[PDB]
Symmetry: C5
Subunit: 205 residues, 5 copies
Amino acid sequence: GEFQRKLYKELVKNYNPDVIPTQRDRPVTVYFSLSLLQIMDVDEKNQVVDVVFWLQMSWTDHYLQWNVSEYPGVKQVSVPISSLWVPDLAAYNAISKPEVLTPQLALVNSSGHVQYLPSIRQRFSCDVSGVDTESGATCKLKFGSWTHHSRELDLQMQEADISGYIPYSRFELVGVTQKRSERFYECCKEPYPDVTFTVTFRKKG
Amino acid sequence: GEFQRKLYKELVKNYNPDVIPTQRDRPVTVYFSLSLLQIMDVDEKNQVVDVVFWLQMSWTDHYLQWNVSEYPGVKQVSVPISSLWVPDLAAYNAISKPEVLTPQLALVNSSGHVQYLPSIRQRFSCDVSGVDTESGATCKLKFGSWTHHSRELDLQMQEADISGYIPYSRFELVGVTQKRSERFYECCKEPYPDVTFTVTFRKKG
Amino acid sequence: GEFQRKLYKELVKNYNPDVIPTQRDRPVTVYFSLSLLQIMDVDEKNQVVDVVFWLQMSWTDHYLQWNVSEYPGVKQVSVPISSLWVPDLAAYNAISKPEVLTPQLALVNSSGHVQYLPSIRQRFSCDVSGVDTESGATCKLKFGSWTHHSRELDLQMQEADISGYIPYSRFELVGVTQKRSERFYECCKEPYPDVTFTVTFRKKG
Amino acid sequence: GEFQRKLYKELVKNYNPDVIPTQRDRPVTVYFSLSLLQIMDVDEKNQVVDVVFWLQMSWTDHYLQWNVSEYPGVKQVSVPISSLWVPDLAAYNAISKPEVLTPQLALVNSSGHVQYLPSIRQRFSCDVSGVDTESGATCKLKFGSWTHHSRELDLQMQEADISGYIPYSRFELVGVTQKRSERFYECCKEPYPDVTFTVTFRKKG
Amino acid sequence: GEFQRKLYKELVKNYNPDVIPTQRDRPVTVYFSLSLLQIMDVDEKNQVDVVFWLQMSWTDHYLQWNVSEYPGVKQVSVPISSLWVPDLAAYNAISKPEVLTPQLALVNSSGHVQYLPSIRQRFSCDVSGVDTESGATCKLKFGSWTHHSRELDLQMQEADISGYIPYSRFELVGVTQKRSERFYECCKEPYPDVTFTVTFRKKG
Ligand SMILES: *[C@@H]1O[C@H](CO)[C@@H](O[C@@H]2O[C@H](CO)[C@@H](O[C@@H]3O[C@H](CO)[C@@H](O)[C@H](O[C@H]4O[C@H](CO)[C@@H](O)[C@H](O)[C@@H]4O)[C@@H]3O)[C@H](O)[C@H]2NC(C)=O)[C@H](O)[C@H]1NC(C)=O
Ligand SMILES: *[C@@H]1O[C@H](CO)[C@@H](O[C@@H]2O[C@H](CO)[C@@H](O)[C@H](O)[C@H]2NC(C)=O)[C@H](O)[C@H]1NC(C)=O
Ligand SMILES: *[C@@H]1O[C@H](CO)[C@@H](O[C@@H]2O[C@H](CO)[C@@H](O)[C@H](O)[C@H]2NC(C)=O)[C@H](O)[C@H]1NC(C)=O
Ligand SMILES: *[C@@H]1O[C@H](CO)[C@@H](O[C@@H]2O[C@H](CO)[C@@H](O)[C@H](O)[C@H]2NC(C)=O)[C@H](O)[C@H]1NC(C)=O
Ligand SMILES: *[C@@H]1O[C@H](CO)[C@@H](O[C@@H]2O[C@H](CO)[C@@H](O)[C@H](O)[C@H]2NC(C)=O)[C@H](O)[C@H]1NC(C)=O
Ligand SMILES: CN1[C@@H](CC(=O)c2ccccc2)CCC[C@H]1C[C@H](O)c1ccccc1
Ligand SMILES: CN1[C@@H](CC(=O)c2ccccc2)CCC[C@H]1C[C@H](O)c1ccccc1
Ligand SMILES: CN1[C@@H](CC(=O)c2ccccc2)CCC[C@H]1C[C@H](O)c1ccccc1
Ligand SMILES: CN1[C@@H](CC(=O)c2ccccc2)CCC[C@H]1C[C@H](O)c1ccccc1
Ligand SMILES: CN1[C@@H](CC(=O)c2ccccc2)CCC[C@H]1C[C@H](O)c1ccccc1
């Protein structure tokens, strides 16, 4: 429709995707979830794990809301992420650039709530020593904002999800636990929240 | 291509390729089919298939129609996909980005019917255990829109053909099946359709 | 440079690189040749041949012509292919993207004749069964417009060249034949021409 | 506050990111530091070392400061590095392109002080012969500006950090030492500074 | 600096990087040299890998300024996007060049440009004699892909083997350089190429 086209036009007007959408007194709450899909490979020589996982990120961008009466049918839109602000979450212990497997698009409803849900393949540093033992190996996948502290970006975990782990992998996914931490570095005065997903796994047999 | 040069300007005038071209608010019906060309490799350790395949996607974009009496010779135009809306179809169980082998061009006729026919190479998660057996290994290649539900994008399948499959391959096709489904996700209130290409194959011998 | 600079401004003005420069009842004739330089590898398990070759494409684009008197001294210009229309030739049986090795520039003279001469590495589907037999293996490299039928794009062979084939190669180049075909598809009224290069080769024993 | 939005647009206004922000014929002082995270691999045949490290770069950009009373709650911004000048530091003995593992953003505070802190994977030419010996192997990681001399870009080093080295690597990090050098080249009229990080390491066992 | 900022603005004004800055209707003279830093690998089966420092320099008359008008500014560092660069091709490369260094050129007030990319690239070569005492000899052939010798005058400077790493498994026996001029039965004018010949053998 032309309404959806006017709306797309207006969402981008006077909008800078480099500007985190805070409102004074308020940090941007970003809800964050990682679903492990497949353990692609263990490098026992170089201490590396290769994983495929589904990230779920959502937050409210209040510069992106619209009155639905002015845009009758339009209740959500699908938008390329280059055109809006997205959390600068970094994989603290990645040793490779992420390979995004899915279309780089976000959903946005009329309250300005954004949902961005990439599927990603990425290699991480990990001690994979015990992978062929009963206890298994344990990898920490650690994520957090690279440039935004707690009072700018409040990173929130959502519940752990192993439901997506492929059942025919040569690795048995023993468990996944998660932890949110606020670290002080002393670059900065402010703490930076990070979310850590702890994956325990072992060779089947 | 004098009339052709005039047409190309009018088509891109006030056109936003981020916007799914609904009307009513009809879903855009998208016709989808996969023709399998070559099974490039099986990874029995990591459970992956490497395949080369030919997609056929077609849909009607109503903003892309013209009066043919106003452009005498012009029945059809060849257009970069970067300038028009294309379905955001994702391979749900891919573990690599799709590698597009063919020119990224679509054919558009005067009533707005678009055809995009890329040949593609891509790796998928798959249990390839029984590839040495006589019942062979079965891989599900699942495709669907990433951000559009049923009432926005009506994904319909067109019939499979295996005649494109290369005959001098080390794998033989034992079975092929396409099938459309409509599932709910924890996600959304609207169902999302998908098309699943199920292929069964084995080592020759 | 004085008139060259002004001429470059004019060639891109009112010019659309997406529009095939046909005229009513006049296809764009595209002269096309392949010169094999080296056979990098043969994959007998996966049925792939890895080749380096030089393509030579030439055609006339009447929108690219100019009056030499108006630009004295300027008889040809070197132009990035991104800025002019180029033939959308695809490698039909390629299983990888082409790796263009040379600068992506085309030479254009004042009557609009374009020459584009890329050196390319690409991998193709092929039955290399006979590579160690020295009746040899035979690969067919197949090329054609992906979106223009023969009354839009008139694909013409020119005599192939093997003088450039590497003499110290692991593989002995037995011979190369070329063939222009015109094939119909159940889809379209108009046939689509292709050029196929048949290369026969064998390991040096 | 929409003061962040106001500030960003002022920062990029009348600003060129290709221009090093010198004042008064005074050089831009760039403070530089390297923290070694992991030695991914040693290639003893081709004499290559593969490493992941964290660079710290900071400097003052006088064009990028703002009076904080004019933009109330804004004390620092997060900014894509393509919108501001950043040091063109190169690894002089790298044998691969640097792979940047983190978001390409820089922090900037109101007095124009910038912090850019990429984590990076890169391979370096290095004599890795002694890696099995007790004295280990020694690799110079040599960095400097590619195009700015001492009087434009005053490269200074802060102290390196081995506290980030992963404890479960197959290589023990014996030590990292750093040294700042400055030399004339016969090529150019002005001298160039460089910072070299000398890494000693051996195989556990 | 504010002088630099407004100088940059002026250099790119009306400037088209696609246009070889021929003046006059003589060539742009392009000075060209190669410094071998490391032989990374040989593929004796497929007959093929090196890391080298290219040096290129030429005058772009469009890029001159008067230093009186820009007091401090004697040279600037610009992205090579923003200016014309030689379309030099590696005639026998079998891979795309991986450019290791920042893509920046130096330009001085006379419009003299220096572009010194460090590059890793694979080349076709008969490496079969590599273990032998006579070694393997490889040719690295470079030249303009679209400009003939009266648009682009390719000239070679002396080669630098001082940068070759001493701890390589290959010993660098010798390097020579030659400028040639070839006519192709197609194109009126000749096209000049500079070819660096590299002889090297396995140590031990
Ligand atoms: C766009 O998507 C977002 C994400 O789904 C969506 O936002 C959510 O909206 C609901 C309802 O407006 C929010 O729920 C509210 O939160 C507060 C405190 O957190 C509660 O107090 C509210 O609660 C209720 O209890 C009342 C009793 O006094 C009842 O009368 C009332 O009915 C409520 O049951 C309320 O639940 C929710 O917090 C947000 N979530 C986020 C992450 O913001 C938004 O509505 C969508 N936009 C549109 C236009 O649909
Ligand atoms: C543009 O292409 C479409 C698809 O090939 C043509 O449409 C079909 O037309 C037949 C009869 O006209 C219908 O029975 C089908 O249901 C149509 N299919 C779809 C998907 O719409 C259409 O005729 C072409 N337009 C022109 C002007 O030739
Ligand atoms: C532009 O280039 C074309 C192609 O090289 C020139 O045309 C050829 O002209 C020769 C004689 O000059 C003929 O023998 C060939 O058969 C032509 N080839 C083709 C493909 O047409 C053309 O003359 C050039 N124009 C100018 C003004 O120099
Ligand atoms: C911007 O950041 C810089 C660097 O963090 C701040 O400066 C340092 O402050 C300490 C404490 O007074 C000094 O000892 C250092 O010498 C400063 N470093 C530099 C490079 O100047 C600076 O204060 C910040 N600006 C504002 C407005 O907060
Ligand atoms: C710009 O650079 C060129 C080359 O680096 C300078 O030119 C040269 O002048 C010296 C002595 O005057 C000669 O030995 C060189 O052979 C010259 N080289 C060339 C290419 O002409 C030139 O002077 C520089 N411009 C300024 C303003 O310093
Ligand atoms: C970037 N840094 C915080 C800011 C900060 O610490 C910092 C900033 C500037 C200078 C010095 C330190 C933000 C959150 C990430 C953290 C980075 C971590 O050290 C790190 C670096 C490299 C690999 C793994 C982890
Ligand atoms: C992408 N997602 C739906 C959209 C959506 O989930 C969603 C939308 C908005 C918010 C939260 C979730 C569209 C239909 C597919 C489904 C994805 C499937 O679970 C999936 C996830 C990861 C790998 C493979 C498959
Ligand atoms: C793309 N196709 C023709 C058009 C067409 O078929 C077509 C048109 C419209 C609708 C459906 C199909 C144009 C000429 C090329 C041909 C390609 C060949 O099929 C093919 C497909 C996959 C691998 C190798 C070859
Ligand atoms: C690039 N070079 C200087 C420029 C310059 O030398 C030069 C300039 C002009 C002409 C000839 C040489 C600038 C500062 C860095 C220095 C680097 C080193 O040379 C080098 C080159 C190649 C590989 C490793 C190291
Ligand atoms: C491309 N060719 C000249 C042009 C030309 O020959 C040519 C032009 C037009 C028509 C026919 C041939 C320009 C200068 C470079 C030269 C290169 C060499 O051919 C070549 C081709 C492929 C791989 C290696 C080398």
